[PDB]
Design a protein around this motif. Structure first.
Motif, PDB file in Angstrom:
ATOM      1  N   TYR A  72       0.387   6.633   5.941  1.00  0.00           N
ATOM      2  CA  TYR A  72      -0.044   5.897   4.741  1.00  0.00           C
ATOM      3  C   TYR A  72       0.849   4.702   4.401  1.00  0.00           C
ATOM      4  O   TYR A  72       0.330   3.689   3.954  1.00  0.00           O
ATOM      5  N   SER A  73       2.149   4.761   4.685  1.00  0.00           N
ATOM      6  CA  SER A  73       3.072   3.620   4.587  1.00  0.00           C
ATOM      7  C   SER A  73       2.561   2.387   5.346  1.00  0.00           C
ATOM      8  O   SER A  73       2.467   1.297   4.780  1.00  0.00           O
ATOM      9  N   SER A  74       2.152   2.569   6.603  1.00  0.00           N
ATOM     10  CA  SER A  74       1.545   1.525   7.434  1.00  0.00           C
ATOM     11  C   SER A  74       0.125   1.154   6.988  1.00  0.00           C
ATOM     12  O   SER A  74      -0.272   0.003   7.122  1.00  0.00           O
ATOM     13  N   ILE A  75      -0.653   2.095   6.444  1.00  0.00           N
ATOM     14  CA  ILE A  75      -2.020   1.834   5.955  1.00  0.00           C
ATOM     15  C   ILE A  75      -1.998   1.011   4.656  1.00  0.00           C
ATOM     16  O   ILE A  75      -2.743   0.038   4.548  1.00  0.00           O
ATOM     17  N   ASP A  76      -1.110   1.327   3.710  1.00  0.00           N
ATOM     18  CA  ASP A  76      -0.854   0.508   2.522  1.00  0.00           C
ATOM     19  C   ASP A  76      -0.399  -0.911   2.922  1.00  0.00           C
ATOM     20  O   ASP A  76      -0.932  -1.900   2.411  1.00  0.00           O
ATOM     21  N   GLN A  77       0.522  -1.037   3.896  1.00  0.00           N
ATOM     22  CA  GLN A  77       0.919  -2.346   4.433  1.00  0.00           C
ATOM     23  C   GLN A  77      -0.228  -3.076   5.152  1.00  0.00           C
ATOM     24  O   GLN A  77      -0.317  -4.293   5.026  1.00  0.00           O
ATOM     25  N   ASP A 127      10.075   3.092   8.607  1.00  0.00           N
ATOM     26  CA  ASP A 127       9.134   3.903   7.828  1.00  0.00           C
ATOM     27  C   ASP A 127       9.847   4.700   6.714  1.00  0.00           C
ATOM     28  O   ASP A 127      11.082   4.754   6.670  1.00  0.00           O
ATOM     29  N   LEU A 169       6.465  -5.787   5.555  1.00  0.00           N
ATOM     30  CA  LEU A 169       6.287  -5.833   4.106  1.00  0.00           C
ATOM     31  C   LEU A 169       7.161  -4.748   3.451  1.00  0.00           C
ATOM     32  O   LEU A 169       7.745  -3.898   4.127  1.00  0.00           O
ATOM     33  N   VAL A 175       4.785  -0.358  -0.451  1.00  0.00           N
ATOM     34  CA  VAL A 175       3.803  -0.774  -1.462  1.00  0.00           C
ATOM     35  C   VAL A 175       4.048   0.004  -2.770  1.00  0.00           C
ATOM     36  O   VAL A 175       4.074   1.245  -2.716  1.00  0.00           O
TER      37      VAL A 175
END
Lengths: 289, 110, 301, 673
Positions: B60-65, C13, D4, D7
């Motif tokens: 989800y970290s990569s999906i939000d990004q 990450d 980035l 979020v």
């Protein structure tokens, strides 16, 4: 916990794993059920048999530490260890009486390979995979003081470890001087065959020990008397009585002063000489009791 | 189709590190459906989402990004449609994570 | 509060944990990037010592051993593994790998050095494992199956000097170290655990006051304090302190410290026990102090 | 791209989904944990306090040349006024029962009260310790009496001293108030002086202003109760006659104060409150001087003041509330806090309550919020308790003492005074907690670099506080394991007296390199302190290892000596016996590395040459040639039976054989002459 078989819970667990319905976790265990399987496979039992083996091995050591080796065999026989009940015989001295020409027939005693058996029992004492109490059981029957002292946890146990091995070592020295064996190619260890013994030495080694309990018990009044009665030294014992009176007269245990008096009366009744100025002052201290 | 069987998240981290946003959108479009069992064998996953299996996971970290990396170009209708293609599919997945959670709790309370 | 350092931990990450050594000379950090990263942090520097890749999932906690055993680290993962790592001659390799769990292992904690080198681990199947170093590279493993229902989330050991538990001992014997730990789970329970006279592990007491899944639980160090104290946090946003005012009573009291606007994730005791840190669901830490009036006051807001 | 940020949580696809247990990246994929370190350090990963900070809990912005003196001077005062007891495995520190500490602290804060930037906190500590000087300290008045001083005289001198303190707490505000009022209203300036007992200055200003019958009235008010009753009548008459409403309210406020009236009710229905606009100290001072006789107690002035600021059913409030000096002037009407059932007050008010009632609370008295604007500053809290414990107050809880001692020991660890954190933890009466707390703290802070600062703290702990030095070196051994140095591990384990750990490390890591560099006199320094029979009879494997290396060194030393002095045959007999005792023992060394095997063979080549020099001194020539003794004249018959046991390689042993055939051929070439 075991009450119908030796290692009953590991046996049950193996018979349960042999069933094609075993949806259990596979804990690493022995797959064989001879008593060497834990050390040959270097695998554990399950923890009920592994409590009973540790319980049993302390009771077997406690019985042998009390001369009850025949009860230790009966406890091995009672707990299904028919094998360990047999190992607890292999130290017996060899004899065929019939060599001298009997008129009838007499039994052959002992173990004609007692030497090889002691070498094998010393090997069972020195691998860290054996329990401290099983190592001590075979050590107390093979001269391994060095693996016996790791269980002797009183002053009496520590004196016993030295004296039990001193007799066993002196017995091996007379046997290996008098009994000309042939073609035996293995030695009993030179730390035990080359052991010089004296009574004085044992009661210096008992003051060299790291076991703080033994160093505190080796300063109490009856353990001091026990050292001197074993040595036969009445001269140093009367200087102990002087070394006590000169510091402690009014404060000594009344039953110890009864004992000190009656030991001087026992020595006098045997015609044995004492430091009579101190004998006088023990008697004067006991009239003053 | 070798590296998806090792880490589809370390591949998605690489695709974001290199701006490959359409390959990232279709990689996420495969990965979510591989967790829904339509291709689990191509993503190394032993067991797809069930109240009879280990618990699943997604980056989800990569999906939000990825949703931000698309939305940073909000003047393009293609970036909007590629973002919706992820969002609409992530509720089609998360309604099934909710049901699989309810189906599992009803198997750890009986 | 004042900052010392701002470590650029090279993780791509989400970070799940950040723990220093017993002296505050090193830092270990774990992540969703399948790595544990170790740093030297002395005098406000940063130097990367190792990128310990070798879990296969996200790593959820790290724990340093006591320096009495040398430079040892443990870490646990989503892939069902717990890995133990060691520095020898200055290089890091794996010194154990335990995969004996049936889902994700969410927490790890070492025993007080007084108990021996023992690790505890909590799992999403509902179990707990204990790993005892026996010697010469070997480990005993005990698995407390079903220790929590729905799942186990956190584990924390009791300090080896339980207050009051020495008064009956005449001078010259050893302390009988009554090994205990606490654990939290998705059954809303905190549970206390003890080793018995056969070496088996037992549920000693339950602690029931959260209305939702317990996220974490930490035991307070028995430095100066004559009471035994625990903190625990929850999916309904509560934090409870728990006191045990008499170690012979074994009786515990729940004291509500706060209730936040979202989840609370973690609870962390100061090395002098006098202060608690609390990780909030709005990405914050808050810091909390017991007064001489025994009231819990914030020191961050 | 660039990567980035994480979020922000309200835009996460995981937002609110923490209960979706079947997806671990919803159940924990936005969780984090945090780690404490020593000195109140923290490791973090949040929104403001990927990356990690290292952070500290710390008090104020570092003037170490100033900050440290506010810990260290009070601590080097308290360490004169406790005894150190050494009858347990960990020593105990106990207060000296008495009074003196109050003056040590009061005169120290009188010096410190000047130029120092903590001036608000230091001046509040000055109020607290000059209040302890007023309430329990004496050195001057009572102490003149060569008899046991009666309780009545004590109660009176306590009131005489507090009847100074309530002026000293008021002067600077009166002196500003007068500097402003004097030139606009001399009546308010005269009133301000009277609220600090400055009756002489009030009379002086009234003769300077043209108010001479006010000056006369004020000059007499120091004793005669008749004037208090005459003004009581005069106010009753001016009210009943409605003549009050032609006199200044400011002047009626003076007449009400003098008449001992805290409030006056005028014919207008105005009220004049005499305590209006005043601070809490001058409010209590009005109760001590104007509302009571000379013959009342402190406890009656304090209770009449508490009767003046609370709600009753029958009277309006007329006094202000006692509050810490950091909350004065704030305008805070504390709005009856709907959790806080104990309202906050000044430490000076709590001490006045403990003087008025021996069983009054100690918890709200020792809590830092009563003293400072900081819940982490236990500096005064612990030093108050370790005076009250010396004054035989004993009704604090053991949790509250534990929280005080652990919080102040943590305040001392955090700002780097860890040796004084040990001084605080050594006041723990519980032995089992005291030993563990001191050993656990030592195990963090003891360094392998024995710096002037480590050495100063180690000598302070051992020579003042009697901390057993065994634990400093237990800690250095645990540090030497983490920083891998096995010489400093061996040495610090040896500084903890367990022989077998030092010996079985020496024989594997220190013996072989020391022999290889002929550094004998260093290796000897470990071995002769292990050698005494009360240590060496406990050492495993000693006689075939440590004794072999050491007898080799002592054989070299005894020849180093015989090569310098006219020594006897008795000493050369001993040397030959010591060499013969060594050959078939270098034979027996446990050599684990090629270095150890080289140390063993060079020891052997050295011993084979030592044996020759020892024997040519047993075989000196007849007295016909003034020549030196020849090592090549030594009989083969005394060399070969001992060389034929030495662990020597070919490159050492065939040279020995060339030396042996040289002496054999001389036993022949001097057998045919």
């Amino acid at each position: 916990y075991a009450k119908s078989v030796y290692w009953e819970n590991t046996l049950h667990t193996l018979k349960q794993r042999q069933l094609t319905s075993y949806v259990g976790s596979v804990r690493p265990l022995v797959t064989e059920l001879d008593p060497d399987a834990p050390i040959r496979q270097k695998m554990p039992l399950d923890d009920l048999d592994r409590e009973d083996e540790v319980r049993l091995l302390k009771y077997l050591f406690t019985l042998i530490r009390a001369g009850m080796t025949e009860e230790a065999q009966r406890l091995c026989k009672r707990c299904g260890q028919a094998w360990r009940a047999a190992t607890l015989e292999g130290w017996k001295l060899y004899h065929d009486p019939n060599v001298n020409g009997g008129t009838e027939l007499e039994p052959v005693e002992g173990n004609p390979y007692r030497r090889i058996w002691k070498i094998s029992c010393w090997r069972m004492a020195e691998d860290e995979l054996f329990n401290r109490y099983e190592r001590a059981i075979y050590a107390a029957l093979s001269g391994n003081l060095k693996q016996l002292l790791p269980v002797c946890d009183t002053w009496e146990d520590t004196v016993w470890a030295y004296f039990r091995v001193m007799v066993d070592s002196l017995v091996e020295q007379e046997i290996q001087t008098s009994v000309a064996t042939l073609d035996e190619t293995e030695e009993l260890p030179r730390e035990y065959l080359g052991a010089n013994w004296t009574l004085e030495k044992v009661f210096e080694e008992l003051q060299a020990t790291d076991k703080k309990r033994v160093l505190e018990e080796n300063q109490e009044h009856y353990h001091i008397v026990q050292k001197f009665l074993i040595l036969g030294d009445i001269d140093g014992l009367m200087d102990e009585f002087s070394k006590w009176l000169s510091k402690s007269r009014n404060n000594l245990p009344g039953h110890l002063l009864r004992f000190m008096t009656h030991l001087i009366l026992f020595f006098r009744t045997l015609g044995l000489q004492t430091k009579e100025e101190v004998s006088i002052e023990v008697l004067k201290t006991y009239i003053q009791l | 189709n070798s590296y998806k069987k090792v880490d589809a998240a370390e591949l998605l981290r690489l695709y974001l590190n290199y701006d490959l946003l359409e390959e990232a959108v279709d990689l996420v479009s495969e990965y979510v459906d591989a967790v829904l069992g339509k291709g689990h064998q191509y993503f190394g996953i032993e067991f797809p989402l069930s109240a009879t299996a280990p618990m699943v996971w997604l980056p989800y970290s990569s999906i939000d990004q990825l949703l931000q990396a698309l939305g940073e170009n909000s003047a393009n209708s293609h970036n909007i449609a590629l973002s919706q293609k992820i969002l609409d599919k992530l509720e089609d997945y998360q309604q099934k994570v909710d049901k699989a959670t309810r189906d599992l709790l009803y198997r750890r309370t009986l | 509060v004042s900052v010392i350092n701002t470590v650029d931990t090279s993780h791509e990450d989400m970070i799940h944990d950040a723990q220093m050594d017993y002296y505050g000379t090193r830092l270990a950090t774990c992540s969703s990037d399948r790595s544990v990263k170790i740093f030297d942090v002395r005098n406000g520097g940063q130097i990367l010592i190792a990128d310990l890749r070798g879990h296969e999932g996200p790593v959820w906690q790290v724990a340093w051993a006591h320096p009495m055993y040398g430079n040892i680290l443990a870490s646990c993962s989503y892939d069902r593994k717990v890995i133990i790592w060691r520095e020898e001659n200055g290089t890091w390799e794996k010194s154990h790998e335990h995969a004996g769990h049936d889902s994700s292992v969410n927490s790890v904690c070492w025993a007080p050095h007084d108990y021996g080198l023992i690790l505890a681990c909590g799992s999403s199947d509902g179990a707990i494992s204990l790993l005892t170093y026996t010697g010469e590279g070997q480990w005993e493993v005990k698995k407390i199956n079903n220790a929590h229902t729905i799942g186990c989330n956190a584990v924390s050991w009791a300090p080896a000097v339980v207050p009051g538990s020495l008064i009956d001992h005449p001078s010259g014997q050893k302390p009988n170290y009554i090994k205990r730990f606490a654990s939290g789970g998705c059954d809303n329970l905190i549970k206390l655990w003890k080793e018995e006279e056969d070496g088996q592990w037992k549920e000693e007491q339950k602690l029931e006051a959260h209305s939702d899944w317990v996220r974490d639980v930490a035991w307070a160090p028995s430095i100066g304090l004559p009471t035994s104290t625990i903190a625990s946090c929850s999916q309904d946003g509560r934090v409870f302190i728990w006191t045990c005012d008499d170690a012979s009573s074994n009786t515990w009291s729940p004291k509500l410290l706060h209730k936040f606007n979202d989840v609370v994730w973690h609870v962390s005791w100061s090395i002098t026990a006098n202060i608690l840190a609390v990780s909030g669901g709005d990405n914050k830490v808050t810091l909390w102090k017991e007064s001489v009036d025994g009231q819990w006051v914030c020191i961050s807001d | 791209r660039r990567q980035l940020g994480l979020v922000p949580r309200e835009k996460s696809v995981t937002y609110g989904k923490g209960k979706l247990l079947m997806d671990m990246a919803l159940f924990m994929g936005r969780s984090f944990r945090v780690g404490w370190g020593p000195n109140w350090t923290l490791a973090n990963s949040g929104e403001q306090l990927f990356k990690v900070h290292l952070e500290k809990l710390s008090l104020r912005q570092r003037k170490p040349d100033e900050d440290m003196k506010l810990y260290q001077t009070p601590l080097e005062l308290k360490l004169k006024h406790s005894t150190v007891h050494v009858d347990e495995l960990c020593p105990l520190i106990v207060p000296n029962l008495g009074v003196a500490v109050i003056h040590d602290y009061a005169d120290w804060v009188k010096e410190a009260s000047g130029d120092l930037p903590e001036a608000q906190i230091v001046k509040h500590w000055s109020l607290t310790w000059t209040l302890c000087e007023a309430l329990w300290g004496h050195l001057k008045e009572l102490d003149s009496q060569l008899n046991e001083p009666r309780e009545y005289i004590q109660i009176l001198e306590r009131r005489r001293a507090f009847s100074r303190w309530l002026s000293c707490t008021a002067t600077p505000q009166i002196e500003e108030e007068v500097s402003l009022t004097q030139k606009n209203s001399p009546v308010e300036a005269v009133f301000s002086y009277l609220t600090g007992k400055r009756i002489s200055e009030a009379c002086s200003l009234a003769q300077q202003s043209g108010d001479h019958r006010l000056a006369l009235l004020l000059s007499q008010f120091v004793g005669s109760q008749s004037v208090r009753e005459l003004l009581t009548m005069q106010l009753v008459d001016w009210h009943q006659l409605q003549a009050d409403s032609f006199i200044q309210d400011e002047r009626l406020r003076i007449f009400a104060l003098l008449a001992g009236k805290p409030v006056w009710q005028l014919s207008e229905k105005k009220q004049i409150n005499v305590c209006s606009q005043l601070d809490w100290k001058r409010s209590l001072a009005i109760h001590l001087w104007y509302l009571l006789p000379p013959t009342a107690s402190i406890s009656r002035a304090l209770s009449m003041y508490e009767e003046a600021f609370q709600n009753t059913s029958d009277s309006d409030r007329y006094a202000c509330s006692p509050l810490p000096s950091y909350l004065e002037g704030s305008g805070c009407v504390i709005a009856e806090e709907q959790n806080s059932q104990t309202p906050l007050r000044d430490v000076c008010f709590h001490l006045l309550k403990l003087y008025s009632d021996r069983h009054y609370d100690l918890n709200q008295l020792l809590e830092p919020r009563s003293i400072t604007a900081d819940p982490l500053d236990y500096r005064l809290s612990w030093h108050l308790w370790e005076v009250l414990r010396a004054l035989n107050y004993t009704h604090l809880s053991a949790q509250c003492e534990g929280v005080l001692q652990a919080s102040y020991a943590g305040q001392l660890e955090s700002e780097g005074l860890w040796e004084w954190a040990i001084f605080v933890l050594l006041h723990i009466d519980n032995s089992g907690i005291r030993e563990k707390a001191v050993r656990e703290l030592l195990t963090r802070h003891c360094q392998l670099l024995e710096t002037p600062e480590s050495w100063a703290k180690e000598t302070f702990l051992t020579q003042k506080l009697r901390v057993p030095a065994k634990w400093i070196h237990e800690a250095k051994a645990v540090r030497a394991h983490m920083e891998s140095d096995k010489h400093l591990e061996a040495l610090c384990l040896f500084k903890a007296e367990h022989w077998n750990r030092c010996h079985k490390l020496i024989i594997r890591h220190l013996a072989s390199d020391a022999i290889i560099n002929e550094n004998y006199d260093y290796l000897k320094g470990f071995l002769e302190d292990l050698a005494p029979p009360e240590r060496s009879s406990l050492i495993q494997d000693w006689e075939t290892s440590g004794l072999v290396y050491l007898d080799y060194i002592r054989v070299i030393e005894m020849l180093r000596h015989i090569q310098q002095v006219d020594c006897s045959g008795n000493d050369l007999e001993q040397l030959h016996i010591k060499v013969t005792s060594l050959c078939s023992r270098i034979e027996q060394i446990q050599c684990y590395s090629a270095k150890d095997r080289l140390a063993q063979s060079d020891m052997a080549k050295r011993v084979a040459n030592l044996l020759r020099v020892v024997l040519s001194l047993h075989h000196p020539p007849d007295r016909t040639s003034d020549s030196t003794p020849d090592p090549q004249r030594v009989p083969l018959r005394l060399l070969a039976p001992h060389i034929g046991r030495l662990p020597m390689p070919e490159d050492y042993a065939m040279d020995e054989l060339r030396s042996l055939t040289q002496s054999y051929l001389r036993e022949l070439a001097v057998g045919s002459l």
